[PDB]
Design a protein around this ligand. Structure first.
Ligand SMILES: CCSCC[C@@H](N)[C@H](O)C(=O)N[C@@H](C)c1cccc2ccccc12
Ligand SMILES: [Mn+2]
Ligand SMILES: [Mn+2]
Length: 369
């Protein structure tokens, strides 16, 4: 009923009734016309629809509470000197325990991102990576949890040198701006316009040089689907366009990335992140090793993202060629680290929000961010 100092009690056991704490509930933003959205707070019609998907909102909540408790724990011990592997393994051990991992019914939604400095995302150490976190590093901790495929995609930035403070505030404010702007019938391009305007209102000084924070233009938020981290819609970060509005019942990951570099990322470094193409159907395979690896992926990850370290812990070895085969066949997709220019600094903040009938819920919101 009470969590232990180092988190070890499953969230499922801290709430016997199976009813988990809601996230931040917000009234939908008014339209340019000035039209309020308070009517949804209690409009029999919407209220009915909302309660209908209560078990689904509840699954997200259990995953969100696990996410909050895991990250609070991480923020207490993450320090320079630790290897990136020690960090991810210490975090994932806790995550698996609080989410009470159970195959595809409960577990880690994707690999623990711990991208450093100019690298903004998709970096998690592979076996043998001797990288050590440094005092001047700016690390993006991006991890996910899920219950029955209801995914919580939430992230924050870690630093130890106060010189990055305004950069972090800039991105945090940008993400919160995106969250505030989001809502039913809201145009995706407007959300991006709003995010950029706030992000660029920040100027920062790091080691004697000044910069106007830039959103990383080729990175963005996205809608979320069951077992599908990227459901199909993208949430800009800058003046964009897309081609659609947000819809009732949808779930979104609102994330922004800020940089002191070019504000554009490119593939770099060894790949660690991989994810089966959601749209690829069953594909017969005779090649022994390739066939086995695909079965391992289908059994343990399904359409969720995974990493090499997660294959290692399952006792798999000498699987690289088989993995490359699956990628070359288009069955699996590689997601290498995305980095801006050398010497640049990037930051990120992310939350998962639920566009419920009666309101907008920043389900992953915590006392930290
Ligand atoms: C590589 C699968 S883990 C999902 C990564 C996720 N945790 C991250 O926060 C976000 O979700 N990053 C964005 C930039 C992204 C990565 C890969 C494909 C995308 C496709 C559409 C929209 C955003 C995408
Ligand atoms: Mn993320
Ligand atoms: Mn995301």
């Amino acid at each position: 009923k009470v969590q232990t100092d180092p988190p070890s009690v499953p969230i499922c056991d801290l709430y016997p009734n199976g009813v988990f704490p809601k996230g931040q509930e917000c009234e939908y933003p008014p339209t340019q016309d000035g039209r309020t959205a308070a009517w949804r707070t209690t409009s029999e019609e919407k209220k009915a629809l909302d309660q209908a998907s209560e078990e689904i909102w509840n699954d997200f909540r259990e995953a969100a509470e696990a996410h909050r408790q895991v990250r609070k724990y991480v923020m207490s011990w993450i320090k320079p000197g630790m290897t990136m592997i020690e960090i991810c393994e210490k975090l994932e051990d806790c995550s698996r325990k609080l989410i009470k991992e159970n195959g595809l019914n409960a577990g880690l939604a994707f690999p623990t991102g711990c991208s450093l400095n100019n690298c903004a995302a998709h970096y998690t150490p592979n076996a043998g990576d001797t990288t050590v976190l440094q005092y001047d590093d700016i690390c993006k901790i991006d991890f996910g949890t899920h219950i029955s495929g209801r995914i919580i995609d939430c992230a924050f930035t870690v630093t130890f040198n106060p010189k990055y403070d305004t950069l972090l505030k800039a991105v945090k404010d940008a993400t919160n701006t995106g969250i505030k702007c989001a809502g039913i019938d809201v145009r995706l391009c407007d959300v991006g316009e709003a995010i950029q305007e706030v992000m660029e209102s920040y100027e920062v000084e790091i080691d004697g040089k000044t910069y106007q924070v830039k959103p990383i233009r080729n990175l963005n938020g996205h809608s979320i689907g069951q077992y599908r981290i990227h459901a199909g819609k993208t949430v800009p970060i800058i003046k964009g366009g897309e081609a659609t509005r947000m819809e009732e019942g949808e779930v979104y990951a609102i994330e922004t990335f800020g940089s002191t570099g070019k504000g554009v990322v490119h593939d770099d470094m060894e790949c660690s992140h991989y994810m089966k193409n959601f749209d690829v159907g069953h594909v017969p395979i005779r090649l022994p090793r390739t066939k086995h690896l695909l079965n391992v992926i289908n059994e343990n990850f399904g359409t969720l993202a995974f990493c090499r370290r997660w294959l290692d812990r399952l006792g798999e070895s000498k699987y690289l060629m088989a993995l490359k085969n699956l990628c070359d066949l288009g069955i699996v997709d590689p997601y290498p680290p995305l980095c801006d220019i050398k010497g640049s600094y990037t930051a990120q903040f992310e939350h998962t929000i639920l566009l419920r009938p009666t309101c907008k819920e920043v389900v992953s919101r915590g006392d930290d961010y």
